[PDB]
């Protein structure tokens, strides 16, 4: 029951190493500025921007001498380094070896590594120098047999290209089949399996969905490991716009960022806009966004109120009475992007909008599985190139996420419940319904029991071997587990 | 040096035959309704609606049909039916089977039709039944050897697709070398065909497509002529992004506001005479419409006044049940397939211009009379680069040797003979196409009552002086008085009452 009808147009994917695409980008853009480096940022190895010739000539270089050192094809190698041209470089670098990177959190500590490197069976890690400290204890623990570290004195990327060799040449792969990545799901930890195919694909669905072009600049502020925010550095390559990398989310900057740099386009979580906007309504500083089209957000819903909030203080304070917001609505599996509002549709904006090129979006009963008309809830399913393969080393949930129809096409089970409304559009209710603290703590060796709970901040309640009791505080406790998650617990209180 | 920037995003063209799509689609889009004949209706030999697998099964058995009675690939078919389903079956045909439709006008008087099939060397025709009169007279002289009669008694398409085996693979083709349609256009008239290759087409589909935001959700209703590229262009999104087309055999615009209604047109178009006669009749008329699903009415093959523009959405909110509908236009020509630009959905406020150049197409201005490239604000001749830049006119050397310009790198532009320039935005604002500058200031002549002015050969400005002042003027007071106002200058006078 349909009163308006509108999506986005089918395209065309070519099969094709995602690699490809940095090779056309430099024929196509040429000296066209790619990449800038803004504040605030972290230590890098490459300049404060590169053009797309250097981007693709940098790349092949790394390719070479990663490769000579002994990265090989499908090899699952761990990268940790924040928002920086030399994050992207690897990535890009590792994809014209054919490897499959894993993105890890930067924010990550002794715990959390050991467990992604080990789940993921990663072989080689490129980690930056301000956290390889974090790595040191437990590397060992792990099956990494090389580390290469970003802004290091041994085993930097610079000394890797001066071993490599300009004139590297991508590895074959199987689009389809050949894992590109393996983003780590942020409830159950599980790697997603993106192949080339998935990614190219995204990028192209998420440059017609937004109408992002070469005549764009992207601020970015949010976590590039992230597969949501890299999904948007990667058009770059595909669509030849610029894009501006932060080290970190500074509210401050950001604003400063999009006015110096004339950002056309940026988006954040909506906690990330609410500390944007506390900022520009504060602060006594005038801003120049008269460039910004769109400033849009992710992750999950934003409330009405914020985004009013935001278009009024960009036209009293950031010289931009035309602002418009719009949301993209996705999932890890997705690479992640699945829908958003066209832009004939910004009135909206406060709807998760409509399925991306080639996606078909359906509503699903919870009851007994049936197809869901206009209005009704139920889970929400999805199909199209950019579906993921599936999950990493998870046999089980590989069997159970799926749903097919009448002519055996198969859709992902998303975990999320919604309905699609009179228009067309998707409203996206709500997921179907602490553990890592406890695994943690039960590997302390005075510890014989542990069980984690919120309180109004964590706290344990442990219980220690007998022959612990007296030599351990719930002091020693705190900092023990501050030095090795990022989520620490706050208070203990030990008991028989 | 833009106070806003906006444009369309790069894409992939796939290298393959246009009939590859029929294919596809067929996967894609299934049991999905594609096409649908509305009123008026012209005889047909198809249903009055299939579906994507209909469309590519018919298309198979008549392919190998036309195959089998001596279509091959590279001819020059001619092709002149009106609007139907017909039509599009028939360049789908031929398309499996790499032969080279021309289309024809069906409104050719009878030598135009001979001056065509002789001058596009066409060898095979296919025909509406009720046109059919008007070649006879005449093909006697011309290279035609074998006439397929649509709704005809003997060599219909039934007949033909009856010979024709539902197996059938499209003949594989040199994508960017094989041409696949030669429309003809009359730019300048004081005729010639143009060659668009599978993947100048393929690739202006795809660019069409994602510059007007139009997919597997809409349905077209289409009012123009199908043998014009541009509505043509628009009845290929089918098999491109699976939307529902609507044809109508002729232009009525009662009907055209009736098919939006019954078929829920959600997109539709019209050359700006057509839409003054549809606003006529919509605000003389007192009948009423549901457009509730109608998002845009565009406009094409020339500017639109911004008068007639607001007044088409005052009436479609004030007799046609939809007062959000925005208008938008597509600027092109026949050697670009012909989409070139439009008006990004973000900024429709700009509908009154001609937009910005759709994905992978490179656009500039140049000077008119040294030839440099020019910036934004300076009028100058539109000069376009793309996937979909034709491959050049068929058989017209001269032509295809002085409408190239060259950038800096070597890189050839198609001088489109258009005269604009680019806003502070980067939208295009086309003027006029390729004297007036004289004949106007002298206008102002207050003495001069009218005046023609001519290129001598190695200007002379007629003159036709008021009454008033017959005699008491001169041949050096023009001359002298022009001289200290332009720079040009008319070098010959001559009164003639």
Same mark, same amino acid.
């Given at each position: 029951?349909?009163?308006?009808?509108?999506?986005?147009?089918?395209?065309?994917?070519?099969?094709?190493?995602?690699?490809?695409?940095?090779?056309?980008?430099?024929?196509?853009?040429?000296?066209?500025?790619?990449?800038?480096?803004?504040?605030?940022?972290?230590?890098?190895?490459?300049?404060?921007?590169?053009?797309?010739?250097?981007?693709?000539?940098?790349?092949?270089?790394?390719?070479?001498?990663?490769?000579?050192?002994?990265?090989?094809?499908?090899?699952?190698?761990?990268?940790?380094?924040?928002?920086?041209?030399?994050?992207?470089?690897?990535?890009?670098?590792?994809?014209?070896?054919?490897?499959?990177?894993?993105?890890?959190?930067? #924010?990550? %500590?002794?715990?959390? /590594?050991? !467990?992604?490197?080990?789940?993921?069976? &990663?072989?080689? @890690?490129? $980690?930056?120098?301000?956290?390889?400290?974090?790595?040191?204890?437990?590397?060992?623990?792990?099956?990494?047999?090389?580390?290469?570290?970003?802004?290091?004195?041994?085993?930097?990327?610079?000394?890797?290209?001066?071993?490599?060799?300009?004139?590297?040449?991508?590895?074959?792969?199987?689009?389809?089949?050949?894992?590109?990545?393996?983003?780590?799901?942020?409830? #159950?930890? %599980?790697?997603?399996? /993106?192949? !080339?195919?998935?990614?190219?694909?995204? &990028?192209?669905? @998420?440059? $017609?969905?937004?109408?992002?072009?070469?005549?764009?600049?992207?601020?970015?502020?949010?976590?590039?490991?992230?597969?949501?925010?890299?999904?948007?550095?990667?058009?770059?390559?595909?669509?030849?716009?610029?894009?501006?990398?932060?080290?970190?989310?500074?509210?401050?900057?950001?604003?400063?960022?999009?006015?110096?740099?004339?950002?056309?386009?940026?988006?954040?979580?909506?906690?990330?806009?609410?500390?944007?906007?506390?900022?520009?309504?504060?602060?006594?500083?005038?801003?120049?966004?008269?460039?910004?089209?769109?400033?849009?957000?992710?992750?999950?819903?934003?409330?009405?109120?914020?985004?009013?909030?935001?278009?009024?203080?960009?036209?009293?304070?950031?010289?931009?009475?035309?602002?418009?917001?719009?949301?993209?609505?996705?999932?890890?599996?997705?690479?992640?992007?699945?829908?958003?509002?066209?832009?004939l549709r910004l009135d909206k904006s406060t709807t998760q909008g409509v399925p991306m090129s080639d996606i078909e979006l359906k509503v699903i009963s919870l009851e007994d599985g049936r197809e869901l008309g206009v209005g009704e809830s139920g889970e929400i399913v999805i199909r199209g190139p950019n579906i993921f393969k599936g999950y990493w080393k998870r046999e089980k949930e590989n069997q159970e996420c799926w749903w097919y129809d009448e002519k055996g096409r198969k859709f992902f089970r998303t975990g999320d419940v919604g309905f699609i409304d009179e228009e067309g559009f998707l409203h996206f209710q709500d997921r179907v319904k602490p553990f890592e603290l406890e695994a943690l703590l039960m590997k302390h060796e005075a510890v014989?029991?542990?069980?984690?709970?919120?309180?109004?901040?964590?706290?344990?309640?442990?219980?220690?071997?007998?022959?612990?009791?007296?030599?351990?505080?719930?002091?020693?406790?705190?900092?023990?587990?501050?030095?090795?998650?990022?989520?620490?617990?706050?208070?203990?209180?030990?008991?028989?």
């Amino acid at each position: 029951e349909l009163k308006y009808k509108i999506g986005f147009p089918s395209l065309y994917y070519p099969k094709i190493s995602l690699a490809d695409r940095i090779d056309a980008a430099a024929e196509k853009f040429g000296e066209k500025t790619a990449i800038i480096s803004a504040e605030p940022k972290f230590p890098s190895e490459f300049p404060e921007s590169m053009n797309f010739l250097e981007i693709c000539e940098v790349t092949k270089k790394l390719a070479s001498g990663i490769s000579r050192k002994g990265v090989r094809k499908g090899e699952h190698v761990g990268v940790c380094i924040p928002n920086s041209i030399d994050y992207v470089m690897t990535i890009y670098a590792l994809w014209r070896v054919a490897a499959t990177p894993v993105p890890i959190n930067p #924010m990550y %500590k002794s715990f959390e /590594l050991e !467990h992604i490197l080990n789940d993921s069976e &990663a072989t080689t @890690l490129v $980690v930056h120098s301000m956290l390889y400290e974090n790595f040191k204890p437990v590397l060992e623990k792990t099956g990494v047999e090389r580390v290469f570290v970003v802004g290091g004195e041994v085993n930097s990327l610079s000394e890797v290209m001066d071993s490599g060799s300009e004139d590297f040449e991508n590895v074959k792969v199987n689009p389809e089949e050949d894992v590109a990545l393996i983003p780590y799901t942020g409830g #159950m930890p %599980k790697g997603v399996m /993106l192949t !080339h195919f998935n990614l190219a694909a995204n &990028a192209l669905q @998420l440059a $017609v969905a937004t109408g992002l072009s070469h005549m764009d600049t992207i601020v970015g502020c949010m976590p590039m490991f992230h597969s949501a925010e890299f999904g948007l550095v990667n058009l770059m390559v595909t669509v030849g716009n610029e894009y501006v990398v932060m080290g970190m989310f500074n509210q401050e900057m950001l604003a400063e960022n999009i006015e110096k740099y004339k950002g056309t386009f940026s988006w954040a979580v909506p906690p990330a806009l609410n500390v944007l906007v506390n900022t520009l309504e504060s602060s006594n500083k005038t801003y120049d966004w008269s460039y910004l089209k769109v400033f849009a957000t992710g992750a999950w819903p934003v409330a009405p109120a914020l985004v009013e909030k935001l278009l009024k203080l960009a036209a009293e304070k950031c010289n931009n009475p035309r602002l418009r917001h719009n949301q993209i609505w996705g999932m890890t599996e997705a690479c992640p992007m699945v829908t958003t509002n066209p832009p004939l549709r910004l009135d909206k904006s406060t709807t998760q909008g409509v399925p991306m090129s080639d996606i078909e979006l359906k509503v699903i009963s919870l009851e007994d599985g049936r197809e869901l008309g206009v209005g009704e809830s139920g889970e929400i399913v999805i199909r199209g190139p950019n579906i993921f393969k599936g999950y990493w080393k998870r046999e089980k949930e590989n069997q159970e996420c799926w749903w097919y129809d009448e002519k055996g096409r198969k859709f992902f089970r998303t975990g999320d419940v919604g309905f699609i409304d009179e228009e067309g559009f998707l409203h996206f209710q709500d997921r179907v319904k602490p553990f890592e603290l406890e695994a943690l703590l039960m590997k302390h060796e005075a510890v014989m029991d542990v069980a984690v709970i919120g309180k109004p901040v964590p706290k344990a309640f442990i219980v220690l071997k007998p022959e612990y009791r007296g030599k351990v505080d719930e002091e020693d406790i705190i900092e023990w587990v501050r030095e090795r998650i990022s989520r620490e617990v706050e208070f203990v209180e030990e008991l028989p």
